Amino acid sequence: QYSSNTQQGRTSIVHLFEWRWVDIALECERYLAPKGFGGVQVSPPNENVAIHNPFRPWWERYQPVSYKLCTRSGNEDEFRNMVTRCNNVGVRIYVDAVINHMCGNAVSAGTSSTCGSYFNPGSRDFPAVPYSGWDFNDGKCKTGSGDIENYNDATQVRDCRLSGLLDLALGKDYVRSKIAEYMNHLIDIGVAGFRIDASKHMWPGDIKAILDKLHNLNSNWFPEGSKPFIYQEVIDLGGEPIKSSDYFGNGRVTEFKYGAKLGTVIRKWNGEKMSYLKNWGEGWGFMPSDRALVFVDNHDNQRGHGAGGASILTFWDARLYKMAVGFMLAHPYGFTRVMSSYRWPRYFENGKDVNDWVGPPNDNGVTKEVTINPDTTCGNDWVCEHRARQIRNMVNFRNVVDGQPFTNWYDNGSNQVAFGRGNRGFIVFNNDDWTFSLTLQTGLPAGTYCDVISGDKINGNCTGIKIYVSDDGKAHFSISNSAEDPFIAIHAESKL
Numbered sequence: 001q002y003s004s005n006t007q008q009g010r011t012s013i014v015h016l017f018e019w020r021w022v023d024i025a026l027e028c029e030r031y032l033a034p035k036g037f038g039g040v041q042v043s044p045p046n047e048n049v050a051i052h053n054p055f056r057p058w059w060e061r062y063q064p065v066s067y068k069l070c071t072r073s074g075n076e077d078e079f080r081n082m083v084t085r086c087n088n089v090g091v092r093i094y095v096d097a098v099i100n101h102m103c104g105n106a107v108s109a110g111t112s113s114t115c116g117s118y119f120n121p122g123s124r125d126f127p128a129v130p131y132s133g134w135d136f137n138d139g140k141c142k143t144g145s146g147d148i149e150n151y152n153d154a155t156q157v158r159d160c161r162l163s164g165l166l167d168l169a170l171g172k173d174y175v176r177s178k179i180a181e182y183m184n185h186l187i188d189i190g191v192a193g194f195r196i197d198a199s200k201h202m203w204p205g206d207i208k209a210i211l212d213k214l215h216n217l218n219s220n221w222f223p224e225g226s227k228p229f230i231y232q233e234v235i236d237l238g239g240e241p242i243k244s245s246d247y248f249g250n251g252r253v254t255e256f257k258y259g260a261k262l263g264t265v266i267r268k269w270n271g272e273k274m275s276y277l278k279n280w281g282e283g284w285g286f287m288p289s290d291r292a293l294v295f296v297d298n299h300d301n302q303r304g305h306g307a308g309g310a311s312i313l314t315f316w317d318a319r320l321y322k323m324a325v326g327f328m329l330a331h332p333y334g335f336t337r338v339m340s341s342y343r344w345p346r347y348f349e350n351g352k353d354v355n356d357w358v359g360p361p362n363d364n365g366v367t368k369e370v371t372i373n374p375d376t377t378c379g380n381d382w383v384c385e386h387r388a389r390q391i392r393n394m395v396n397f398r399n400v401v402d403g404q405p406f407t408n409w410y411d412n413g414s415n416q417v418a419f420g421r422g423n424r425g426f427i428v429f430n431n432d433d434w435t436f437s438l439t440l441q442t443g444l445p446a447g448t449y450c451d452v453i454s455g456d457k458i459n460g461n462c463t464g465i466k467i468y469v470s471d472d473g474k475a476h477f478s479i480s481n482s483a484e485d486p487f488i489a490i491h492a493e494s495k496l
């Protein structure tokens, strides 16, 4: 469950949050395959409640009504088409699995669902599964409200309703079997693994029991005996009884400490500075590298949901965000996930974004297609971080340097730092209020390299900055503090 199952020489996943299946399929073929992306995390593909107050929020997708593959992203046919087309170009699909719960207990009964299935939350009736009152934790939960009231109590965290979401009785074989049926449908279609949503809210042993029922990966694309990649969403920032380590038996785990700390460093808040990144990774108290799923922001915390945090960097803070993503993609710690977002009308009132609920770009609830502008950016309010040259070229940097050790670290005791990855790549950052101008040991063979942050290598020349590495591995770097992108990266495949 720890192996990504990506094509050899591909090392990242991109979250195409709320994208439609037909758009992901095209993106696999036209962009992700040729640019060396490993795979795509997709939004939950199962049927959810259609929530009309507020208007079609992104979070309606975290309120299941059934396991039919029928959502605003598309139907089962389009989902199958996408997984096939992506695998056929060597790009994997990872599904956001919403398995802890069904919908909110106060949602009105009827057919307000993305495939029109009937459901009745008040009577615990979900006949399109089917589930009944016997399949939820109402009798098991010991809180007065029936909801989770206290994260200091590990038992209620697992057995009670997260924010009122109907909590499935994952201790029962019947329920485990219905979930496994859903996951095996996805595996057989060709999915390479799963983000297990709300993992903290399930017993590690119930997750195990479900995983035990799963098929091996589809034997047309994956070697015989291949198991789905599992990464579990557990928010563990310390101070609670439940630990990220409790879930290592099942797969990798999201390391939320990573983006919180990195955002603080890059913002130069709380006395932090880039020179302190010398021991980044387990040195900062993070989980083992071979279990961490890392990221700068995710779909929750980029809009203040989840653990939130003021330090989180997002596309809204573009200059600092690209730097943070660049550092993440250069550094060997963890398995890297890149966020790809849409714009929404952020509006702060009393410190909170009152529009943190807004769903994807839409026409009366119908998700907009991803349009491609002439300069390869996206239209229709999709941000497409993964198409920014500075981020896309760093995704390739990570591929090029895969397996190479962290070496040749330099820092100025403040915010000018640099490091290499064996003899295959080198990166330099200036986050101080003055120019970074210095000759550094790069560890690279002698030659002329294209900086892949400012430009690209094409037909024997560079479109941006060129770096000249001499016979002894040394090169001069000059980065103004007023640079729009104050970092430079060179690698084996950017050499002229």
Ligand SMILES: C[C@H]1O[C@H](O[C@H]2[C@H](O)[C@@H](O)[C@@H](O[C@@H]3C(CO)=C[C@H](N[C@H]4[C@H](O)[C@@H](O)[C@@H](O[C@H]5[C@H](O)[C@@H](O)[C@@H](O)O[C@@H]5CO)O[C@@H]4C)[C@H](O)[C@H]3O)O[C@@H]2CO)[C@H](O)[C@@H](O)[C@@H]1N
Pocket (backbone or CB within 6 Å): 059, 060, 061, 062, 063, 098, 103, 104, 105, 151, 162, 163, 164, 165, 197, 198, 199, 200, 233, 235, 240, 300, 305, 306, 307
């Ligand atoms: C009925 C209910 O509906 C709406 O809730 C929505 C949330 O507002 C959205 O954020 C979203 O939730 C997703 C989800 C549920 O499927 C789980 C994910 N993330 C969770 C995480 O798993 C939880 O553990 C919890 O995090 C807490 C930490 O565990 C604590 O240590 C501490 O930090 O506090 C946090 C925050 O409480 O919440 C996270 C968001 C997943 O990634 C989410 O996207 O979708 C739900 C369902 O629609 C309404 O907003 C709410 O008002 C209603 N009561």
Ligand SMILES: [Ca+2]
Pocket (backbone or CB within 6 Å): 100, 157, 158, 159, 160, 167, 168, 201, 202
């Ligand atoms: Ca639970």
Ligand SMILES: [Cl-]
Pocket (backbone or CB within 6 Å): 233, 254, 298
């Ligand atoms: Cl996540």
